[PDB]
Amino acid sequence: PEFMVTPALADLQEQLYNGNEKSQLAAMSTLSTAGTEGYHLLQEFLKDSATFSPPPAPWIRGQAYRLLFHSPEASVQAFLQQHYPQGVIPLRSDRGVDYQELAKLLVAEKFEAADRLTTQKLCELAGPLAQKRRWLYFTEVEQLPIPDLQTIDQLWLAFSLGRFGYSVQRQLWLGCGQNWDRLWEKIGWRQGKRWPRYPNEFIWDLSAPRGHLPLTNQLRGVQVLNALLNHPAWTA
């Protein structure tokens, strides 16, 4: 047996475990409105779904974790403290970089703050000089570690329903015939004839276009973003 019982919630449970992504997301959303039993089912799903192979989209467990994270139930918060104290996405670095705060900001939907920290973390990864400079040379981007970039991308995917991340930007860019002008329009980085004003003219929630976040500053040209989107992390 795949899971433990619950009956108005029985079909919701089967959908959560065995549904396609759209069905799973709808099911967990509804379960989060179904009180103590609904949240218990989501807890069980986090436990059970860890066994699924191959890897499901990271925002299925990410959003389930988010719903639990937002629960008022003391039992749920204890569960999360006991089993997921640093969230649900593995945090991996080759350079001892801490991504716990990025994970916390993202689950809490603090997308502007998370984007600020993401930019800072790339500079941290590039070493002390970059960290002080507060921006990157494209050659530094080419050399960022795969595990670190994957952690950052997985966090953005997991907490954006798959809408945000460098890997999303890569896919949209490749799908735009690698044309940067098309990309800027596709991901919402144009305000008429100028760049949008940072931060107020960007969209800091999941209504934003796919690929909208994270931000890479275009005022110094496309070379940094080009290095990010062509990085070996996305085909490793």
Describe this structure in words.
This protein is an all-alpha fold and 236 residues long. The longest helix has 16 residues. The two termini are 35 Å apart. The chain folds into two domains: 160 residues, Serine Threonine Protein Phosphatase 5, Tetratricopeptide repeat, CATH 1.25.40.620; 76 residues, Arc Repressor Mutant, subunit A (Orthogonal Bundle), CATH 1.10.10. The chain is globular. Helix content is 55%, strand content 0%. Helix 1 packs antiparallel against helix 2 and helix 3 runs antiparallel to helix 4. It is built from 13 helices and no strands. This is Ycf53 protein. GO terms for molecular function: tetrapyrrole binding. Pfam families: GUN4, GUN4_N. It comes from Thermosynechococcus vestitus (strain NIES-2133 / IAM M-273 / BP-1). The PDB classes it as transferase activator.
The Rg value, from CA coordinates, equals 19 Å
Give me the CATH fold name of the largest domain: Serine Threonine Protein Phosphatase 5, Tetratricopeptide repeat
| End-to-end Cα distance | 35 Å
What gross morphology would you assign?
A: globular
| CATH second-level architecture of the largest domain | Alpha Horseshoe
Beta fraction of the residues?
under 5%
What is the SS-derived class? mainly alpha
Strand runs, count: 0
Query: So how many helices?
Result: 13
Domain GUN4-like: 93-232
Organism: Thermosynechococcus vestitus (strain NIES-2133 / IAM M-273 / BP-1)
Domain GUN4 N-terminal ARM-like repeat: 5-85
InterPro entries: ARM-type_fold, GUN4-like, GUN4-like_sf, GUN4_N
